[PDB]
Amino acid sequence: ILSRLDPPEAEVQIDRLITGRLQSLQTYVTQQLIRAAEIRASANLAAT
Amino acid sequence: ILSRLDPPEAEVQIDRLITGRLQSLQTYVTQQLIRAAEIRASANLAAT
Amino acid sequence: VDCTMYICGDSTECSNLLLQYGSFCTQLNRALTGIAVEQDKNTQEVFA
Amino acid sequence: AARDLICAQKFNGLTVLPPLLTDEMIAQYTSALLAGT
Amino acid sequence: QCVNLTTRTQLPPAYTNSFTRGVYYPDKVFRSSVLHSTQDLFLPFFSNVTWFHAIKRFDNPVLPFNDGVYFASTEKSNIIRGWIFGTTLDSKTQSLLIVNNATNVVIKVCEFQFCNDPFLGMESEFRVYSSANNCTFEYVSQPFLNFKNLREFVFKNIDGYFKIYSKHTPIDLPQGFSALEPLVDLPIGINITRFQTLLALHRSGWTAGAAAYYVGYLQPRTFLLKYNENGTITDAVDCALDPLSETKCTLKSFTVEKGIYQTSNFRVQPTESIVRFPNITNLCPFGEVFNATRFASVYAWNRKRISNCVADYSVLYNSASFSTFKCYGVSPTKLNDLCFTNVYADSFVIRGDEVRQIAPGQTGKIADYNYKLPDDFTGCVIAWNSNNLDSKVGGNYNYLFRLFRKSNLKPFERDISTEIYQAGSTPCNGVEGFNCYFPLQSYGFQPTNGVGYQPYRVVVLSFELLHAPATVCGPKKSTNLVKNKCVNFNFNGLTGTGVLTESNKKFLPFQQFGRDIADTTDAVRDPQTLEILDITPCSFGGVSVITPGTNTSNQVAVLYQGVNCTEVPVAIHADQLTPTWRVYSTGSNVFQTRAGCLIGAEHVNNSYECDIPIGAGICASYQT
Amino acid sequence: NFNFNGLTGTGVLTESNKKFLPFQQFGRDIADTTDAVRDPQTLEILDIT
């Protein structure tokens, strides 16, 4: 893309790629948080 | 909009509409997960 | 939820444009499956 | 006569599934527990 | 010299259950202990494949090359030398001659001049094509040359190349797995739609041997492949054969544990379409313009503004010939769908000699003096002679001609000047005299006047495009409606899909649409007859698969969801977005449940513990 | 950093002993990335990391 297309247009597609990666790792972080919460509940039960 | 004008910018409109609707779907899904977790906790308490 | 027909009805032209987004529907489907099975799991453990 | 909310939300990509256990069986379980106790 | 024979026998297409043949490496990538998925043109498994027998007897038929040929040849003694491919295999077009020589092949895409049969007195008596022509692309290289040889060749012509994925595999068909490799890539890049296999026949009249061959084709299919510790393919799985294969493809595994799984969705896939539209009322008169007993004068042509009707251009090409619609900005057939405020139609009469004078940027007596046309005019013109009517016998001194003016004129205006023209240095004072002239003269038509001076009524249908709803656009048609069926509809511009039934709702006289709480259409008032109908789109649902462990058995049970299977597609060829695996109903114990209904399992009056939950107080198990 | 026939990459190069077939050009891994290349001047199979 850099060797065939100008940065005047690269930034749009790389920007959509960024935001796609950001919602990817963002829902990733969200599900990680949910799993961490449920794991913490399980650990508390085990401690009791 | 499919029968008014040219594909090159009709496709722009289609792209933007797709983005908006997918974002809304994501929001609804996240809300559902949160409510499900809370209901799960209440169910465990009731079982005990 | 039926993701494709939700996002753009039956317009076959749109379905071509949805391929360029990667796997963006299976995650939602599997999350919904998980919550659905969790509901029945909860009822069974609380009553049986 | 009119369309129910079930079919209404159906015809836009949303479906509602039925549960596994039924009210008769739930009542049977409750009655069994009460008799036992 | 090209020879004749009368030895042939035929056979309807014999079939075998093609087990596991038709696989090839799709790329040049190396993988190990990795499972991959692909999707391209492929030969389906367990498909009916034709057997052709050639053995006096002689068989060189012409056969199609739709996509590609899966060629299996159990042959010996080299009864075949080479082959040919092309588009028509005749003289006029280009064709390919890929003849595998005794130690070579020759290729050439070029013009030929064919007989029906090639041979030599092995072809240098080059009666493949009985006359020599030029050729372009040629290639010479090293020779690429109980049944024990299995010549498997796949012919592919895409991306402008000749993908001969050639595998000289040394061997009905053996129940096993064997892939095949590419061998040569040549960029020819022409159509090539038909081919004929060519053979090598040697004499003992003439003599031929015994051989057998088969024909196959490829379709776009999704496939699953398996690789061992090395880069050798071991097994493959089709993803469109059976629900078990679909489950394997979805789960991305070769073994499936006991359970219930979801594969895909289902809809009705509607048929045909309906275009209900209202009636047509308002008409405007063209007979008054095209049939006036006394036409408008050359100077006082009438500019008529058109509206408050319909534009029935359908009846506008229904006139006898001679219609000079050298029109601008629109096609005639298209005309009926355009809309304008003011169609300023102009009507005058001009002698037929100079019909071409009135046009954008045209010269002539009336074109530079009487009527000069805009260079940006968009509209059509209809002309016709009125030699029979517009000229009277006893001397037509009633009608009049005009021939002169002072200067040039703007586009689109009416000129009725009849005044004296000042010609020379002497003044005129408005009377004929010293360098003075009065232009007007009459027809004085007797039936004798010639073709050029015979009338040709020219009507300039000036569709001046401006901004109005323009009642006068064009007539609209309609069809008949069919009820209780999956139908695409368009109600006066409101498009959609569904089924239509009756109702009891009471609309107000001035309501057309109807919306529910969910903000969507539910009822429509049909225009032609003022009734009320209820719109219900076509049903749909998901698909679930019930199966025991793979290590146990192979039978499966299939569930539909939320559909009354009084309505399940009994199917003709395709009315089911489930991938068309309908099963016979009576013997398979079709049973209506509250979760759709099931096909493939029977019901008993016994009762046991639950093994596989299906739903709504039902279970299933593999027993007995 | 290298560029084999337009294929860019970076890492330590070493001899790799996977039984490449003649029609096989280069190697890929499970994560869908380049792993092994052949020199189009001496024709030797190599490893990348």
mmCIF file of N, CA and C in Angstrom, chain D residues 4-19:
data_model
loop_
_atom_site.group_PDB
_atom_site.id
_atom_site.type_symbol
_atom_site.label_atom_id
_atom_site.label_comp_id
_atom_site.label_asym_id
_atom_site.label_seq_id
_atom_site.Cartn_x
_atom_site.Cartn_y
_atom_site.Cartn_z
ATOM 1 N N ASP D 4 -48.881 -10.957 17.013
ATOM 2 C CA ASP D 4 -48.260 -10.970 18.326
ATOM 3 C C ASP D 4 -46.834 -10.431 18.256
ATOM 4 N N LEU D 5 -46.349 -9.968 19.412
ATOM 5 C CA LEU D 5 -44.980 -9.476 19.501
ATOM 6 C C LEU D 5 -43.974 -10.545 19.102
ATOM 7 N N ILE D 6 -44.293 -11.819 19.345
ATOM 8 C CA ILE D 6 -43.377 -12.902 18.990
ATOM 9 C C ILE D 6 -43.087 -12.886 17.496
ATOM 10 N N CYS D 7 -44.132 -12.974 16.671
ATOM 11 C CA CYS D 7 -43.929 -12.956 15.225
ATOM 12 C C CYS D 7 -43.415 -11.601 14.753
ATOM 13 N N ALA D 8 -43.867 -10.518 15.395
ATOM 14 C CA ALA D 8 -43.409 -9.188 15.006
ATOM 15 C C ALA D 8 -41.894 -9.069 15.115
ATOM 16 N N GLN D 9 -41.331 -9.421 16.273
ATOM 17 C CA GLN D 9 -39.880 -9.429 16.407
ATOM 18 C C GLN D 9 -39.251 -10.565 15.614
ATOM 19 N N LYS D 10 -40.026 -11.609 15.309
ATOM 20 C CA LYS D 10 -39.513 -12.689 14.480
ATOM 21 C C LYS D 10 -39.114 -12.181 13.110
ATOM 22 N N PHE D 11 -39.963 -11.375 12.498
ATOM 23 C CA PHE D 11 -39.812 -11.139 11.075
ATOM 24 C C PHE D 11 -38.796 -10.056 10.763
ATOM 25 N N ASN D 12 -37.936 -9.748 11.736
ATOM 26 C CA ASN D 12 -36.842 -8.801 11.585
ATOM 27 C C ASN D 12 -35.499 -9.400 11.992
ATOM 28 N N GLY D 13 -35.418 -10.716 12.179
ATOM 29 C CA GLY D 13 -34.170 -11.366 12.530
ATOM 30 C C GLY D 13 -34.013 -11.733 13.990
ATOM 31 N N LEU D 14 -35.065 -11.647 14.793
ATOM 32 C CA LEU D 14 -34.989 -11.966 16.212
ATOM 33 C C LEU D 14 -35.947 -13.109 16.523
ATOM 34 N N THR D 15 -35.460 -14.122 17.235
ATOM 35 C CA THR D 15 -36.269 -15.286 17.564
ATOM 36 C C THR D 15 -36.207 -15.560 19.060
ATOM 37 N N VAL D 16 -37.277 -16.167 19.567
ATOM 38 C CA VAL D 16 -37.423 -16.501 20.980
ATOM 39 C C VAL D 16 -37.549 -18.012 21.094
ATOM 40 N N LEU D 17 -36.686 -18.615 21.889
ATOM 41 C CA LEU D 17 -36.726 -20.059 22.043
ATOM 42 C C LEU D 17 -37.478 -20.440 23.314
ATOM 43 N N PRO D 18 -38.092 -21.619 23.349
ATOM 44 C CA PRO D 18 -38.833 -22.033 24.539
ATOM 45 C C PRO D 18 -37.908 -22.656 25.567
ATOM 46 N N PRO D 19 -38.288 -22.635 26.842
ATOM 47 C CA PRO D 19 -37.444 -23.245 27.873
ATOM 48 C C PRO D 19 -37.454 -24.762 27.776
#
